[PDB]
């Protein structure tokens, strides 16, 4: 298990291997970041929102989450985008990411990005792209407002809250 801010992750599959890399991000600066390599899958959680994340090097491939309070859905999605180190996420930054922690030090790059995008999600979602929603019965698409929609944030899908076995 591990934590990335409010995000909690449990490995489902794959191996965790990290290499330091220099990354030119969207504001024209170079950041030194431990980049994860390899296909990995995780159980993910933020508040009451849970999901499954599938990713590879600097690429969020698929994110399946459940319906929950909208603030927890949105934070889960953003944190997963940042945690996945997706290239679209790096390209979304504008101006300086020079936030200080409570000790007067600069946050490290991954935490700069977490802080930047949690509070400026439209910069992320605009670079992320939208695709047609899935039309597999159990899944629906989700838009920037965390509403069910005919289009969806690319690679993101949501399960419906259904009483499958008629428990009531």
Swiss-Prot record:
Cell compartments where the protein resides: Virion; Host nucleus
Origin, by domain of life?
Viruses
Subunit structure of this chain's protein:
Influenza RNA polymerase is composed of three subunits: PB1, PB2 and PA. Interacts (via N-terminus) with PB1 (via C-terminus). Interacts with nucleoprotein NP (via N-terminus). Interacts with host ANP32A (via C-terminus) and ANP32B; these interactions promote viral RNA synthesis.
Q: What does this protein do?
A: Plays an essential role in transcription initiation and cap-stealing mechanism, in which cellular capped pre-mRNAs are used to generate primers for viral transcription. Recognizes and binds a wide range of cap structures of target pre-RNAs which are subsequently cleaved after 10-13 nucleotides by the viral protein PA. Plays a role in the initiation of the viral genome replication and modulates the activity of the ribonucleoprotein (RNP) complex.
Q: Which family does it belong to?
A: Belongs to the influenza viruses PB2 family.
Q: What is this protein called?
A: Polymerase basic protein 2
Q: Which organism is this protein's natural source?
A: Influenza B virus (strain B/Lee/1940)
């Amino acid at each position: 298990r591990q934590r990335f801010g409010r995000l909690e992750l449990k490995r489902i599959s794959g191996r965790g291997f990290k290499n330091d890399e220099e990354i030119l991000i969207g504001n024209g600066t170079i950041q030194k970041i431990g980049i994860w390599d390899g296909e990995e899958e995780f159980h993910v959680r933020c508040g009451e929102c849970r999901g499954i994340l599938k990713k590879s090097q600097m690429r969020m491939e698929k994110l399946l989450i459940n319906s929950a309070k909208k603030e927890d859905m949105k934070d889960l999605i953003i944190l997963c985008m940042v945690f996945s180190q997706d290239t679209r996420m790096f390209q979304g930054v504008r101006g300086e990411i020079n936030f200080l922690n409570r000790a007067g030090q600069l946050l490290s790059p991954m935490y700069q990005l977490q802080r930047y995008f949690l509070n400026r999600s439209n910069d992320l979602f605009d670079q992320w792209g939208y695709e047609e929603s899935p039309k597999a019965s159990e899944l629906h698409g989700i838009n920037e407002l965390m509403n069910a929609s005919d289009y969806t944030l690319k690679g993101v899908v949501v399960t419906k809250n259904v009483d499958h076995h008629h428990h009531h």
